[PDB]
Every structure is written in C-alpha cells, then in structure tokens.
Point group: none
Amino acid sequence: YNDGYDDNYDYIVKNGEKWMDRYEIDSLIGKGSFGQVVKAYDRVEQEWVAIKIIKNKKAFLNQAQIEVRLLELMNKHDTEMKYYIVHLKRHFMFRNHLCLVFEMLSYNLYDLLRNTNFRGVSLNLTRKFAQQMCTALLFLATPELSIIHCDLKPENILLCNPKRSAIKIVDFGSSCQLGQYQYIQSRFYRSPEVLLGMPYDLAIDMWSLGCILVEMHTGEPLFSGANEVDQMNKIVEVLGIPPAHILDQAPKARKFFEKLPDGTWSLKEYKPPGTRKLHNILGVETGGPGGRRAGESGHTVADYLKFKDLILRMLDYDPKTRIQPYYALQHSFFK
Amino acid sequence: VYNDGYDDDNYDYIVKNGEKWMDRYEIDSLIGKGSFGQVVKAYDRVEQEWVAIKIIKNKKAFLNQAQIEVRLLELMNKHDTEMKYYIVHLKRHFMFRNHLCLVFEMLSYNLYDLLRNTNFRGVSLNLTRKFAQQMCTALLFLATPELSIIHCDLKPENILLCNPKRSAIKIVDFGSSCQLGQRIYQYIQSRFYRSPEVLLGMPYDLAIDMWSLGCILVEMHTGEPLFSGANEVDQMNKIVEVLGIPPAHILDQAPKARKFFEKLPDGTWSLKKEYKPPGTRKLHNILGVETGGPGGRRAGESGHTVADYLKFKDLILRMLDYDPKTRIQPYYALQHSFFK
C-alpha cells in the first residue's frame, strides 16, 4: 500500500531513512490511533526532533488538521506562557502522510512516579509542577484560544531535561474549544460534571490538575475506579454527596444517587460519604504521606494545611466556583 | 476491556445477539463493521419495525463525523418535499452505554453488490437511466439553498436499493459531508470519483458531486471503474487519457498544477512523464455507441441503439466538464434527451 510504503494505514518506518535532504530517521518511539511517532535528527537546524506520522486515512488526517489549527493559533501569541506547551515547529506532507515536527522531550511524570517506586516526590517539587501547570492553564484560557485539553494525566506532562523541574503539556489530540461529546476524560481524572452527563467548560482541566498534584506527592492515584459508578463512589468517599442544586440538574444523576422523601440526595463496601479525609490522605499532622516526610523542611503542618486548601478549591463540585488559574497562582501555597 | 466491559481495546461496543435495549430494541445481528464502528439489525418493539442502528466507535475522529451526519440529516428532515425520499431516513439518535447511536431505516444492497452480481459486466442502459434520474433528483434536493450540502463521498457503495427486486435507491453516507461556506478540507473524495478541481487544489462546490455521478453512471453500465487510479498522479493521468489536457485558464490558476503537468518550450501545458495520449481513450468507444455497447454485449437488445448511446454520451460528457462553472446542474440534467 502506498507503493509498498504503508502497512493498518501506517508508514513502514526504516531506521536510517533520510527525508528530503534534511531529516535522518532514528527509530519509532510511539504508536497511537493517529499513527506513529519517530525520533529524528534535523540537519538544517542541527537538532533532534520528534515527528508525528499520521495514518493514511482521512478521518485521522482531518483530526490532525484541527490539531495544527490550535497549535498554530497558540504559536501566534507573543506571551512567554506558551513555553509550558510542547512546540510545533513545522508540518508537511510526505509519501501521503501528514507529518507534524515537534521538539524532543525527556520523560513523563508517570515515569517519574515509577522512579519513586510510587512513593511520590516532595512537596517542594510538587509546588514547582503545580505553578507551571496553573500558568499553562491560564494560557489556554485566553479568550482568543479557549482550549480544553480534555486528557490531562501524568503521562501527558513531560520533563524538559531529566535533571530539572521544567515541564510541558502534550497530546492536544483530544482537545476542543469552548463551544465546539459525553464520554471524555480519563477515568481517574474525569470531573464530576462529565460523569453526570452535564455541560462542561475549561473547568474540567482544573479538576484533573488537583487529582494529579495529590498523586505526585503520595505516589498513588487519588480516585482509581474500575468503572464510572466506582469512580463516583470513590469521589463521594472524600468529598461527600454533591450539592443538591447540581444533582437536580444532572441527566445521569440516578445512575449514582437517589432522592429521599425529604428531597435530599443519597447514594444508591465504600466508606460513608465524606469520611475518607484528604487531611489524612496527605498526613497533614502525621508527618506526610505514610509519615515519609517527618522533619523534612518545607513539609510543616502550616505547609500541608496550605496545600490542602488549594486542592480542595480545585476539587470543587461546582464548576462555576472551582478555582480559576489566575487566583490559584495567587494562593498562599505558592508564597 | 473498558466501559464496564462493554467496550473492546479498540473502543468498540462488544455486540451480543439477543440483547434488549431500554425495553425497545431487540438486537438481532451485526450487518456491518468498519473504522467508524458497527451496524446492527434490530427490532423496534414500539414502532413494530426493523431498524439499522449504527454504533459509533469511542474515538474522536469518528464521533466528529457522526455529529456532522446527525446535524445535516436533522436539517433535511424539516423539509416538506418528497425529494428527500432519496436520502436514507434518520429516525432518531441517542446515547446508550456511553456510545453514540444513530437509528436509520433498514435498506437492502448497494450498487456495488449489484455490480458483483453482474460479474462486473454492467446493468442495462434502461436501468442506468432509472438510477440516473433518481440520483439527479437527490442532488437537486441537496442544493436547495437552506441546505446546500456536498456529499463528498459519492460512490456505488454509498447508494442503496430499497427492495432487492426493485429499482428504487437512496443515498446513505453523510459523515464526510459539508455545507457550502463550511468547507475546511482539501483531500476530500474517493480517488476513483474525485473531481479535477479537488485533484488540483482549487476551490470547490456542489459540482464535485456531479463529477462523481458521471463516473458512477458509466460504471453501472460497463461494470468497471472509469478512472481507476492508484494514486493522485495515476488518477489525473487516467482522466487525461479520456478527456485530454485540462483548459489553460484552469491550469494557470491551479495551485497543484505542477504536481501533474509542466510547460513545453512553446508554453503550452503537458504531462510530466505507460499512458495513452491525451484524448485517445474515447468515451465513444468505452460505451460502444457503434459496436454493440460495452464490449459488444448489448448487440441487438432494446433501448440500446446508436441513438440511445449518443444521448447517453452527451449527458456523461456534460457531467464531466473540466470547468465546474459550466458543468451541468441537477435541474438542467433532468431535462436532457436521455430522459425523454
């Protein structure tokens, strides 16, 4: 297929092939539904690059073209906040494939958690990740952009250099714009409005950020359900039954809850609603997660208490009142 | 397995025969699988009928198409003309077990299946004419101004018979479709049925669907594709053998002209390097105007005269106009001598 160039519509990567007189192809570094990602060396710019090779099929081409529209929209902004987003350098067609040339980055935050052996990084590293993520989300919310990532998780946050704390966001392939889909985020990081089948905005990315930051300090996912009903039950364990004004507006409300004769809501093997406290998940007064941080600097009771506040503000059930990226950057945790 | 073990590791719904949905649809069997997902035969207990339910794969590429398809079809359902009887009926749509489902009427077989029963030798000129009139009416309805839909994937697979014993047809795949003034894509049709304006990277409109009709009407009578190219350059080259070098005013304004052509030392346009000469594969011969029809197989049959075949050539050559400005339009095509 494609004159012996395509397999499943994918290009048959030849380690050592040269494209134009410019790109030298090293190896395949990723496979997806879109197609493939290879590592390459660009000779005109003397640098290593990552090339996303999209399948030779129009549905996947047309998704990727939307992806270039948002990546270029973001490029045309002069702010420096755009540096927390992975950089699109150029794109071209080659042997009937759309190819998107990106910068090369090091590991993801899931990789980092593997190296802690799922015991977590420190509150001081966490604060550094938290700040950059809040600034990236402030960039994505500028009115002319208005982008919802939709797939925020530790695999999709990449370290720039393996010896430093700079991070970047990647895979805008599940992205939409305000205005532009019901079964959307990844289960562990999926927001309540999404589980309940309600309209969503850029607030769903801030629910995920809170789930992600707690996992980076403890090593383990905050809410790990095997289905939606398990996911919603494990959220109620920590935050209690949701406000009654959100449930009364919620299509899929009765898959999880029931209304009592007094008109309050109730659930329908789990700890009682609200009894799994983030105060003890984080070890606020008990020396941190599993007491592993006792005596460590920057890890005081005053510190954990501030971290708790910010997270609870990110895990607000009401997408209208949940903390917005600017004010989160102003929170005392960051002082 | 995901979605509570209702989705496979391709994000497709694990169909089980016999299953009941919302106390209404008894799922009988799978009648179609694809990239987009699946199609199932199902008995609607409320309405007392069979239906075809298309369950979309839980991937965004495919969900985007289905949302376009739902919007454009729902738009058509508001129109009172009986012309919309040539478009496949969208009964309704919903969300079941975290999947988008579009519920259609159940139809029969497609015009490619019909060609495979002829052993790719063709149907008669009399049947082609019936198929042709219906398709032109379909294209007339789609160009009404409030609608202005381009199908963008017209081919024999996407035209379906209502009953297997009858000549009635409907069009079925609107998920690669767009509206005039909401055009965003440039690689848009199936190679074999793709218009020259699309091959050349130029602007396009509802005329591209007529190019396709011409390519399909000739295939229904001969049994074989007219322009069966392996890539975009073999595709253009196959078109050039039958129709010749495109006009100059067109090629001069065409962004992708130099992917196919180049100028000679006198300035005139010509191909760049197996293929017959331009214009030397003649539709007059492909159809057999004078030689008994395609491969002489219609010699002596009724309605297959030299004058019938001359009228058929005229209409096809009007659908295969290079210039989409002067290519024939559904209303004036319904008025050709072919139909009288």
